[PDB]
Structure formats: structure tokens, C-alpha cells
Ligand binder design. Structure first.
Ligand code: HEM
Ligand code: HEM
Ligand code: HEM
Ligand code: HEM
Lengths: 306, 306, 307, 306, 306, 306
């Protein structure tokens, strides 16, 4: 019955990520923006309804939920954990509102972001405004196909949508965002076989490496987590490449939706802290998480009732 | 006989404007890059040939030409003139190499720019990188359709391509680049009729205003320059919007190609210094020029012979 | 009977509205066509099936229903009410059968209409035939974006499809059709701010005006109807621009699908008769309704299995 | 060289034909419009530049040419000849101005026609306008593929544009406009083989019938005129299906461009009056001409220089 | 609840049919491929996600089911019946594994087939490989529109998906595959009306012939089977044209999905053996069946759990 | 003045290569087909001409020219020269007529080939028929991008169209066709760096290797022929991947157009016989030539005058 936000939509060719902090006394402005965001998205996106698939997902951080709403907090909504392994660390950056805008053209995303920021001209403060674009075969900046094993259909619904465990917030999701900056020089220093061993998949054919050859510290092996029931826990992640050529900045904005934050937290702990058979993820040797945050994206019905 | 660059192409949806300055001792690397920029463009763009429309235009500033080539300089190639008008001024900023990359997708432009700057590591210091996107209705940040009256066909090449006036540099062109930052807050405070009077075109229908009603200080009226023999002086403009909603940065990157810089300089003088019947252009009351430069784009044959 | 006649399909770029009336003795061939309309639509559309998205919706008027079928009538399905306000009027032109054809290309719609009328030749009288096309940003003849606030997903299904209130006719809908001829000269005589105040949304960015500034007599304000339980009533509408510049004729064909006709009747009454705080809709000052009719679009299986 | 109009354009999905008669005293309005038709077309069609492919062609009748322009007349521009055949006839209807608008979507053509008629309010009387649409395989309403043997490339330029025979009007063309109402019942009453014999080509594969079995009175055979020197005489046709289902009106709007009207006049005479081996064209047994006119489409610079 | 193998996917423009026979001792490799086929399809098809629509359907023959799996068998699974009609005979050919690959481009299908065969190298013998391409308007080699009356929506699910009748194998389907070679010259010898009477539909308009004129031995009149309870028995068919001009070979590869094989068996018996009012199907006079097999396509969950 | 036979057309997604041998006494039928091939191509293509891009190129072998035409012969026409290298051989196969059909869909190519072969039924013997498909990323079966360095525009016209050196046959070209079978099993055993060194270009980004480190026996370094006057000899080649997974056949059909066969013969001699610094091309260690022929594709007007 509850209507989830557009989190199950397929990834498009253009996206904008807005991580924004809320200034003191701007709670009412944020409330009315959350009420009107669906109408704003519809108005901006209907001008190109046949093609463009404009979709805005709004999430609220743990530190802002108790300041905006006086009801019951969603279960598991907590500030992003600080993971500091022996070598790499995951830093948590301030963030209260997440606006994830996706469309086939950057113009629609820019217009929607402009409208949203205009409605919040003097009540908030931007933190991590980022534009992201796709490549030829949906590749990332590391040259590998990204998001191949994303759950689809009913599997995605079971993986990312909150069910009867939190009846008051059915249809919501937990989104973990993390901006990484790559080291392209070191990555290009390695051979293609070394890159495949680091990732765990073939670079050209995208065929997953055989289990008897896949290294224990590869990114794919460490992110493959199986729960107590024997089924593999999965999340609907949508990485977006980004960067500026002049500043020699290349990176990836990872966003991951789940029905509970525990799956993403376990994946991050395995990647950073490492398992018994692997000190840490190999992909972290060439990628540093410059920012990280956690948000809760509620159902559209909850947002429309403010 | 000479082969001009891709300066005569339809305005694509995505573009990257790179302006860089050559450091000391980097002339040899710049020459090496210019000797194979066409090959790099072909290699990057052939991967998506039918849908993609990748095209890179390379231009050399007046300062860089003396230190790069020992031959005769192109006629009219001079450092960008700075106009100190009574109210507005056109600032001239350093720049020695311009790469104007255009494609239907931002990924191709980003890959080409990455390859170029990787070839130019250490040799040049980046000065201005702009990622321009084109709206669904190829409108400006002011909401007006841009490039409607661009010359096309034989008129375009007769207006932008150097002919027999400079036989040694036939097929080249002069490109004036200028970055404008718009004051959207003040622009939105004007009625649609006021905006149309400022621009000189109808906002929705894009129909030019009548001669008896068009204001003398409108942008279209001031940029319409008649030649000494009754002909109309024309330039090719590929200005595109750009900006980021995080910093309240909304702007337009203007690039203009001509046979000689005299036409563009006259248009700029009319816009900034004004006319006897108009103190200055009205569009400058809402746009501020923060970067201006002039470059010469030679024929592909000239670049391939280095 | 869960089988709607594709009335939830998104708006396409080309459409044909065909309202006809059946003369005496034509009740037999019309029945034969109604059992073949789906097959004809499939046969015409499958050629362009990858992107043709051809869809035909058939509706039966109040008189035509009890003229053709001898079963129980659907709840409602009254002849279209004629509203005669202090200034504007809503005429109720005769109409028995409505064919709403939608496709990305006009050729598919024209072929389907040609086949339908060839099967119907000699037994119907064409009351109205309108070819509608879509502008750039789904604009209407007034220059505003049309259909922005259309319900989508499960909300549209709950808003247009008949539920358990009429179990015998589940999956159907009630379609109200009207033809408006705009006064383009008067509309262009107004400033853009005046046009936005008349409509209720910004012309450029399609963002609707704030509550404290939106006029009480604007079209959007008057068509925003709140139900007795606080839930706003919604309908699915596909307004198609049409006209010919030779006759200086410009207009919009409005079609509205609802679960019950009462919602559309209330919206029309508020637009024409007006409320206490607004004499009538402002958009009616530049639009004149030349036709008007109400039809019931039954479920696909009901048309296939006549009774 | 003179710049030709948009006559040399490919067949397009949507078209509008607008034939009007200039009222008394409305010469000045038409004259000032003709200098603005190119600007109006550019303004309207630029909004959909990548795919709109909007193009407007303007033609002037003989009486309209006499009333408007006081210069020399083109070699053609005689009032459309009315052929009184033994069975069929080609009526000549009044017409002074022809606007042929072509675009991929009918909205562009409608907007351009609206602009033109608004500029022509109170000065012209619309004789008739036709909204033409293309079927699946560019077919006509008779079920056959239309325009298969149209000239292309330099051959079309030689057979359409006016050359050195009339140097003062180089780049123009002569357009013959006719409106045919088909008898679909009689056409459908014929077998497919009979229809192919009527037309002269196979309906299925669209291949031409072999010359030993093609009937002498077939449409293809009769409109295959051989020049005095043995060179084939050809014209460019852009037939547009049209009709209204409610009125049971089905028909084709034929427009034919030539470098001289005599080619189209000879084709029409062969079709209607017939040859020695054929009383008349067979396709005329199912098509009735209800509107005929002849116009001259001048070069773009001629219209601009007014 | 169980997820099918996307047997309800819309018809695409390119397909590959691969029928192979498992060699002795190759059961383990076949099981591994059946486990990894979903991952292989996801990896190959993700490179072109928006377009392409790559989908692979895997079916196991009756002779191979008892060799690969143990414990239970589908109720309807059995070796394909051979029909020895008075004139036409439907031959049964050895087939153990069926791979039906569909995509908008043949390259994706070829890559998927290459991966599958490489995984199966040394374990299976390729009995048949067919590359089918969609014709002009979904026509077949006979020129008639193919697939017009396929069930869609919930009707297709009720017609092709196994329900509560076989709970252990819910979500599966039964696929009957045949390869017909056409006598194109003899078919073209017939008139268009004769062809329509043989098929039962209009050649151009695809309108079904009236019941008063439709021949009793036409293809449509013979494949229209009414159920015992007055319902209509329906199957999902994807007929793919194929052939080579060098060998003068043209044909259609027919695949039919059903919830039970009884419907397809009844249709084949009516087509070949014929009813009381028709000796056999008329289309069989111009088509010869050179291949026939029956396979069971289980739910994706069953294939994954191996 | 002469019209080229659509040789300069851009590469499409689907192609059909037909090589046939004229039987004794079938010269008249071949002449009739050569006369009617343009009409057949137009008739087949105009159904999908908005985006079909169908184009048929016809070439006549050296032996067939002496039989079909009794006039003068093109200077460069001669039977294909078989090269017997130390380890590799270029076999010459009997081929009299070449039909190279290109279109965005295999449907148009198959229809055109069917019509052509039907007109040639009983007159020619089909020696070879290849259905070539083009990968999603313009790659070949070796995983590298093909045709990156193909000449375009004026350079291509100068390089592939014969001019004043043979005025009687101006507008024609010489096409060399070869059928290659690849050893994918051995090719995949090499590292990506080894594959790049064999080819001579980067596999990922298609960037040509630097002048140093580039092997002297690489394919690119061996097909880069410098003319006597310091210019680079270039040909327009359209390699098409092809094969079947059932027979484990993978290969590339190479077709190369030139203004004279000397350039292609020199390239083949360098690849097979080898230079002083390279025994032979490395790519030949994984590709075997099973077919080789040379044809002369004349101008369209030459074929239309039969
Ligand atoms: C710079 C950071 C990252 C990059 C470039 C990256 C890229 C990739 C790539 C190329 C793959 C293989 C392709 C595919 O499976 O679709 C993959 C797999 C995956 N990654 Fe990431 N990833 C990053 C960070 C993360 C993080 C932070 C998480 C979780 C917290 C994550 C979770 C996963 C999962 C669940 C899979 C699929 C595992 C499987 O298929 O068994 N990734 N990633
Ligand atoms: C006569 C000419 C009409 C025109 C040009 C027109 C056009 C429009 C436009 C531009 C809007 C605002 C944009 C949008 O909501 O998508 C709108 C809103 C709407 N109109 Fe109309 N309309 C017309 C007549 C009608 C009629 C006759 C009805 C009902 C009987 C109706 C019902 C509505 C509704 C329900 C809305 C939604 C407003 C909201 O959800 O806040 N309109 N219409
Ligand atoms: C009145 C209804 C007409 C219809 C339905 C029609 C349609 C056709 C068709 C289907 C063809 C064969 C396919 C093709 O050539 O593309 C054709 C050929 C042709 N028609 Fe028409 N046409 C009509 C009138 C005319 C008129 C009035 C003229 C000239 C005054 C004309 C001139 C030609 C020419 C020149 C050809 C090509 C001849 C050739 O290829 O040798 N047609 N027409
Ligand atoms: C037999 C299998 C062949 C394959 C797979 C193949 C593929 C390639 C590839 C990948 C390239 C580099 C990328 C590109 O130029 O687009 C290339 C270059 C080239 N190849 Fe081939 N080729 C083959 C045979 C031939 C033959 C037989 C010839 C001539 C008789 C030839 C002539 C050329 C030429 C002229 C170039 C351009 C190199 C340059 O301009 O620097 N190739 N080929």
C-alpha cells in the first residue's frame, strides 16, 4: 500500500548528488520543501516526459530526523560509522539532506536542483554537490563494468524496501553515500590481469572470475556476503563516475540502497577492516573515500503528508 | 584545398572548454601533442561513431604562437583586447591553448580531455575547465533560445573560414572565448516583457521583435553589425550554459569563430563601450565577464605537419 | 472483469477522437464491430508494435447503451449534463459511440479509424472527427504544459477504474469529452503574468503558483476538488491540441477518464457555474466549448463477450 | 552562386500545404512577409534543431508575380493549363501563394503556418490547406510505395534547380501542385495483380514490372518521358497522403519540382490526354483532380533581398 | 512466487536458436553451465543495458532430464511426438539442450552463444544453430505478419506459465521448436488472394478474414483450437525468419511456449494429420519441417539452485 | 562528373558479402542484372530509406571482365596474386562478381540479396556468402576497434576513387576481398599487453602505441606504407566480423577499396612476405586467409548504360 520513492528505477546517464546541512531555524523551510518536492519533480520532468526519466530521491540523515520530525525514529537510523582499518579509513562527513537526481540528460537534473536550492536559498548549506555521468558500457573510472550484479525485479524489492519489520515506515530505504577519489596513475601502472585480480571480474568480457582463481582480497569476493539463512545479502548500488580534468580529479560517487543499513555496514567493514583471509579490499589501494554519510529515504506518502 | 578543423559543426548537447597556459620548457611537449591531437580525437571518438559526434578544436593564443612556431604569424592574431567601459568591462585573462571538445555525450568529451591532459602532464598549467551542457530546448540560463541566427551552409564558411586574405593560413579561424556569470536573482525579478526588450527576441516563440519596437540598447540590436559595403557581419557562436547549484553559480561560456577578430572585437566594443544611441548592452546588466581570451584555430593540415 | 481498455496508457504524440451516432437499424453491425475492435487494433498496431504503441478506447453513450444492450445499466451513465452559467455554457452535443485512438504516429491512428469506419459504413453518422497532435513540451494551444498533475501508478488505477461499487462493470471508466475553441487573439493580448494568474502555474518552468498568491478563480484552483474525507478527487485527462490555420481555428479536445462521472461533473460545475469566491473559471474567458458528451468505456472482456 | 531554397530536401513524416490568394491592396503585407519567411522558419524550427528538420518553401503564381514584383519575369509562370481529356480533366484553381512546410512532427509545421497566417492576417484568403502524413513504408493511400524513383544527388540538382537558361532567377524551381481524391472502394474492388498492372510496379517488393509485361497505360509507363536527345526527363515529387475518416475523404497531395514547367506539363498531358497507345492514364480511373496550380519558388537570397 | 526465464519478453529483432546434445560424461559441465547461465547472460547483456534487451531461455529435453536431474520430472515432459500424416510428416530430431537467445542486436546474441559454447566445449555436440532476424514489419518469409495474435498481459502468463497443476515446477514452460524450409518460388507462383486464403489473413492490412469466407483448411482456421470448457487454447510463438541466398534456402524457425505441451501437440496434430473438414494445413504445402523437438524451461530459481 | 558507386558510404551495422562465378552462357543475364541493380537497390531500400542506409556495391573480376565487356579494360584489373610466404599464404579463389550490401538491418541486406540472386537464378554459381554483423563497440572478433584510421571526406575520395590516371573508368575503385578465420583459442592465451603489441594499438582506449616500444612486426606498423613522395598510402577498409558458434568458426571478412590495386597489393606483400626487419605480420599467426579476390567496382553510370 505505501508508495516507495523512485529508488528501484534503472540508473540513467546523468545524475546530481546534493548532500546538504540544515542551518539553525530552517526546519520549517525544509519541511515545506519536503512537502513540495514531489510536485517540483513532476513539474520539471513532465516537460520531457517521453524521454529523460527524471527522478529525485530524498533522504534525511539521523541528526536531522530528530530536528525535523517529532514522531518515532526509523529503526537502524544512526550517524554513519567511522571505520578506521590498519591502512585505510572511512570518514563520515556532515550531512542532513540527500537529493539524488537522475535523468538521461543533465539539463533536467540541473533544473530540478536549481528549483530545490532556490526553495532553500537561505535555510541550508551545500556540502557535496556532485555531477556524475555514465560511460560507453556503463563503466566506471577504473575501466570495469559497474553494477552488473544489481538485484532486479522482486529481488530488488525484497533487498531495498523496508517491509513489516518497521510497519510505520514501510516503503522506505536506507541509502549509504560515499565519495571516493581514485588514483588513476597507480591503477594504470598495473597490468590488465592485475586489475582483474584486484576487481575479481574480466575487464573486457565482464565475466566473473572462477571461484578457484578469484583472490580472497578482491573487491567482488569481499562484498559477497551471505547471511545466517544461507542467502546472499545484496544491495541496489548505483555508482556514478565524476571528476574534473583540469584539477586531475577522478572519482566515483557510490550510493547504496538497502532495506536495513546493517548489510551496507557489514560490506563496508569487510572492505575496510578486512576478514581473516584478507587484510582489506584491494580496490581501496587505489581509491580513497573522501566523504561518507548515511540517510533514510522515506516513502512518498510520508513526505507528502507534511 | 586546405582542410579546416571541425569549427563548422552542429551544436552538440555536451561540451568541454579547456584553456591552459604553457609553462617554461613545455613547448616541445605541446608540439608533440598538437602533432597527434587529431589521431587522439579519432581514437576516442570512433568507439561510438554513429550516435557520437566527438570533435576537438585546437587554438593557439598570441603569446604561445611566438614561442611555439618560428614562421610568420597569422594576420590579426593579437592578445585579447581589454575594454574598460563606463559601467561594465571585459577582463582579459591569461591563456595559451584552447581545446573546445563537443559531443552528444559528456563521456566522450571527458575521455578526450583526460587523454589530452595526460599527454600534457607537467607541460601546461590548467587555467579554466568548463563542462557545458545544453538544455532540452537549447535555451540559455536566461531562458532564451540561443544560436537561432547562426550562419549556416556556404554563408557559415564564408564568414568563419580564412580565405585568400591570408593564403599561408587558409582554412583557419579566430575564436574569441568569454565566460559570463549570470545574476539570475536580478534576472528573475524582471517581467517577461522586460526580458524580451532586453534581449530583443520573444521568449517563447523566439520570433524577433519588430524593428519599430526593438529597443536600441537590446542585445540583438547591438550585436547586429552592418559592414561598410552594406553587408551583414556574422560570426558563429557555440555558447553553452554551465554552473553548479551548490555555489549559486549560473553562467554561459561564449565562443565565437570568425575570419578575422575585427568582427568579434567590433561586436564586443558595441556591447561594452556602447553606441551613441545606447550607453551599453542591457544583457551586461545581468551578466559579468570573468574570463576573456582570443585564439587562432589553424587548419588540420597545419597541425598535422609538426 | 479486471481488463481495462488501456485507458491508463501514457499520452502519445498523435490521436484521433471519433464521436459518431448510430441511426435506426444499425444496432446489429455495431455489436459485430464491438467484438472485433480489439482484433482490428491489434492487427493494425502489430506492424509498428516495437514503438507504435497504438491503443483504441471504445465508449458507449447513455442512449446507445440501453439501445444496444439489454442488460443492467452501469451506475450513472446519464446523458451529459448541460451547464448554463451566468456567462458561459456547456453544450451537450449528440453522441453515441466514442473511439479514442492514440499512437506515436498519425498513420496508425488513421488506418485504425479507416478500418473501423469501413466496418461501420452505412450504420453510423460521424458527429465529430478530430486529429490531435502534441507540441514541444507537451504544450497546449495556450502555451502551458498540459497534464503535469495527472495521477500515475496505483493512484491513477484507483482514480479511473471502477471498483467494487459496480462489480458487474469492474474495470470500466467514465469518459467526459469536450471540444474547446480558443480565442488566441485575446489570449495573446494578455501579459505572461496575467496568463499565469489565469491558469495558476508559471508558464516557463511549469511550477505552480504559491497558495497565498494563486487567484481564487484560476483554472488550477477551481479544478482542485477536495473530497468529503479530505482526499482530493483526481481524474486522468489527455488534452490534445488541434486546429487549422486556414479557418483560423485553434482549440483543444479534452477527454477525462474517471472512476465515477460525479468527479468530472463537479469539476465542470465549479468551472462553469463557479463557487462563492469565484464567479467562473478564467480560462473559459478565452475558450468556448462547442461540443460535450459522456461515455462509458467497459472492460475489454465485456466488449469481447457481448451480452 | 545563388543559394537555392529548401526544395532539395528528403521526404519527411509531416507536411502542410497552404495555398492562398492575395487580396486587393495586400501586396505590401505579402512583400514584407516574404523577406521574413526565412527568419520565421529559422526561429520556429531551431527549437527542435537536432531532429525537427523544418523547411518551408515559398512559391508565387503568375498573377501574384505580376502584381508583386515589377522586375523581369521567369521564363515560366503561366497560369496552370487546364487539360480537357476525353474522360478525365485537370481543373485549374485560383492560387497566388504556396507555402510547403515539412517537419518530422506536425507541431512544427502548425506553428510555422500559424506564424505565417498571423503575419498575413487581413491580406490573403486561404484557398485550402492540407495536413499530410506518411504511412509505414513511405506508402501512399493506394497502398504502393511513393517516391521510389525520385532523383537524388547531383541528378536532382540538375533536374530541379534552374540553371543558366534563366540567369536572373538561378537557383529557383517550378512547382506544380495538384490535389487528388481517391476512390478507395473501386481501388479495393480490384485484385492485387490488377492494381499492380494499373500502377506498373509490384505492391509487395516494390520492384518495377518487367518492360515486356508492363501495360502501356500504366501510371509508371506514361510518366516515363524521354527527352529529345534520349536523356530521361525526371522531376522531384513529394506526394503526401491525406484525408478525413468521418467525411470518407481519402486523397493525395502531389507536388512536383522541376527546372522548367514543360516537363511536368508533358507528364500531365500524357496522363490526361493520353498517347497513341493509351487513351489516358489508368490511375486516373480511381483518382480525381480537384485542385491544380503552378508556382515559382525563387532562390532564398531573392526573397531575402526585398 | 518463482521467477520464470523471461519467456514473456517481447519479440526482438535478432535471435539465436542453439540445440545441442549432451555427450557421455558431460553432465557435470552441463550442470555448471545451467548454474552459471544467468550470471553469464547478466554479464554479457549489461554492457548495453537500455537497448539490447538480451534474454536467454534454457530448456532441457526429456532424454536429458533423467540424465542430469533426479527425484522428479515435469508432468508433460516427454520426447517429441512424430506425426506421420498422409502427405506431410513432422520429423523428430535429437535435442537435449535448447538455448533461445534474443536481443535487438545480433552481436549480443553471438557473444552470449560464444560464452555458452566455450563453457560447454568438449561436453556437447551442436546439433543445430540458427541465426534469425526480424523482417520488415515482423513479416515471415511468406510475407505475412507473424505473431499478431500472441497473448499478452495476464493472458500470456495463464497460457504459458505452469501454475498449481505442477507445484514442484511452477513458473516453467514447455517449448516446442521446429525448423521449416519454405518453397519460396512455389509460394510466389500463387496469387495474393490464394496466399491470403491459404493463410487466412489479409496480406497488407493483416485483418483476419471473415468467418464466412475463411477456408476450413487455412492455417489460422486450423491453429484456432477451442478448449473443452469453451475457452480458447493459446500459445506464445516467436517465429524467426532465417536462411541464406547462396544455397537458395529460406525458412522459419518456430518456437512455441505453453503451460502444457498438450495444446501444442493438438495444434500440430490438427495441422499435419488434419480434421474431418480439412485433410491438412495448406501452409504445409509450401513448408517442410526438417526439425522438431520438445523442451522444458524451468524457473530461474530451479536453474540457479544447482 | 562520373558518379561513384556508393563506395564512400559510412560503415553500417549489417552487411552481406556475395562472391559468385558466372556460368557459361550466363553473360546476358549478368548484364541485365548489372543494368537493373541500381533500380533493385532503390526499390528495396526506399521502404526504410529514412534510416535504412541500404547500399549495394558491385564489382567485376578480371576474368569476368573479358567476357562481359568487349571494350577497354581498367589498367589495374588483374587476377588476385597469390602470395607464398615462408609461413603464411594468401590463397586466390575463383570469383567473378562481388556484391557488397550494407545496411543498418540485416533485413534489407537479405531482401536485396534475395532479389539479386533471384534475377541471377540459373546463371551464376554462388562461391561464397557471408553475413557480417558489427559489434556494439565497433570491435572485431579479436576485441580491437576496427577502421579507426580510415580516411574520411576529401582524403578518402582522393585515396579510393580513380581519377585522371584512367579517364575512361573515372569514379571507379578496386576492391580486394579476403575471408579470414581466427584462432580464438590461441588468441585468448596471450596477455592483453601481448595482444596490444601484436596489433600495435591500445586495446582499451584504441590509442595508438608510441613510435618507440611499438613492435616492428605489429599489424599497424606493417600496414603503414609510405609513398615514394613522402605521402602515406591509404585505403578504405570495412572489416566485418562473422562466424557461427556451432562450428566454432570465428573470423573477419576484410574488404579494401583503393584507387589502384598497387597499394593493397603492397600492404598484403608486407603483411605476408614481410619486410627486412619483420618476417611477417604477427596478426597472421592467429588468422588464416581462406579466400582472396580482386574486383573492379565501376561508376554507377557505367553500369546503368548496359
Ligand atoms: C570506489 C569505490 C567502488 C568501485 C569503483 C566499485 C566498483 C565495483 C565493480 C567494478 C564491481 C564488479 C561489477 C559488478 O559486480 O557489477 C563491484 C561489485 C560490487 N560492489 Fe563495488 N565498487 C566500489 C565500492 C563499493 C562499496 C563501498 C560497496 C558496499 C558497501 C560495494 C558493493 C559491491 C557489491 C555488493 C558488488 C557485487 C558483488 C557480487 O556481485 O557478488 N562496492 N563494484
Ligand atoms: C478548456 C481548456 C482547458 C485547458 C487549456 C486546460 C489545461 C490545463 C492546464 C495547463 C493545467 C495545469 C497544468 C497541469 O495540471 O497539467 C490544467 C489543470 C487541470 N485541469 Fe485543465 N484544461 C482545460 C479544461 C479542463 C476541464 C474541462 C477540466 C475538467 C472537467 C479540467 C481539469 C483539470 C484538472 C483536474 C487539473 C489538475 C489541477 C491540479 O491537479 O491542481 N481542465 N489544465
Ligand atoms: C494522382 C495520384 C498519384 C499517385 C497515387 C502516384 C503515385 C506513384 C507511384 C506509387 C509511383 C511508382 C513508385 C515510384 O515511382 O516512386 C509513381 C511514379 C511516378 N509518378 Fe506518380 N502518382 C500520382 C500522380 C502523378 C502525377 C500527377 C505525376 C506528374 C505530373 C506523377 C509523376 C510520376 C513519375 C515521374 C513517376 C516515376 C516514373 C518512373 O519511375 O519512370 N505522378 N507515382
Ligand atoms: C586479417 C585480419 C585483420 C584484422 C583483425 C585487422 C584489424 C585491424 C586493426 C584492429 C587495426 C588498428 C585499428 C584501426 O586501424 O582501425 C588495423 C589497421 C590497419 N589494417 Fe587491418 N586487419 C586485418 C587485416 C588487414 C589486411 C589484410 C590489410 C591490408 C591488405 C589491413 C590493412 C590495415 C590498414 C591500412 C590499417 C591502418 C593502420 C594505420 O593507418 O596506421 N588489415 N587493422
Amino acid at each position: 500500500e505505501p508508495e516507495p520513492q523512485m529508488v528501484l528505477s534503472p540508473l540513467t546517464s546523468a545524475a546530481i548528488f546534493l548532500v546538504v546541512t540544515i542551518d539553525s531555524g530552517g526546519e520549517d523551510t525544509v519541511r515545506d520543501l519536503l512537502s513540495d518536492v514531489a510536485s517540483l519533480e513532476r513539474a520539471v520532468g513532465f516537460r520531457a516526459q517521453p524521454d529523460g526519466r527524471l527522478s529525485c530521491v530524498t533522504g534525511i540523515g539521523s541528526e536531522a530526523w530528530d530536528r525535523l520530525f517529532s514522531g518515532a525514529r526509523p529503526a537502524g537510523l544512526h550517524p554513519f560509522r567511522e571505520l578506521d582499518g590498519p591502512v585505510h579509513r572511512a570518514v563520515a562527513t556532515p550531512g542532513d539532506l540527500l537529493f539524488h537526481i537522475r535523468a538521461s540528460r543533465l539539463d533536467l537534473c540541473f533544473a530540478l536542483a536549481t528549483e530545490i536550492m532556490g526553495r532553500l536559498r537561505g535555510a541550508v548549506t551545500p556540502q557535496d554537490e556532485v555531477h556524475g555521468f555514465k560511460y560507453f558500457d556503463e563503466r566506471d573510472m577504473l575501466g570495469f563494468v559497474d553494477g552488473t550484479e544489481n538485484p532486479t525485479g522482486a529481488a530488488a524489492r525484497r533487498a531495498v524496501l523496508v517491509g513489516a519489520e518497521d510497519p510505520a515506515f514501510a516503503g522506505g530505504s536506507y541509502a549509504v553515500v560515499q565519495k571516493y577519489l581514485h588514483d588513476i596513475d597507480a591503477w594504470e601502472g598495473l597490468s590488465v590481469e592485475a586489475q582483474e585480480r584486484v576487481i575479481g571480474r574480466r575487464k573486457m568480457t565482464d565475466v566473473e572470475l572462477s571461484d578457484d582463481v578469484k583472490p580472497a582480497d578482491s573487491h567482488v569476493a569481499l562484498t559477497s556476503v551471505t547471511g545466517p539463512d544461507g542467502s546472499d545479502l545484496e544491495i541496489l548500488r548505483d555508482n556514478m563516475p565524476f571528476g574534473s580534468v583540469g584539477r586531475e580529479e577522478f572519482g566515483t560517487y557510490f550510493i547504496g540502497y538497502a532495506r536495513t543499513p546493517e548489510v551496507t555496514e557489514t560490506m563496508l567493514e569487510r572492505m575496510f577492516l578486512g576478514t581473516a583471509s584478507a587484510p582489506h579490499d584491494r580496490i581501496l589501494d587505489f581509491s580513497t573515500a573522501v566523504t561518507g554519510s548515511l540517510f533514510f529515504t522515506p516513502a512518498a506518502d510520508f513526505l507528502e503528508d507534511l
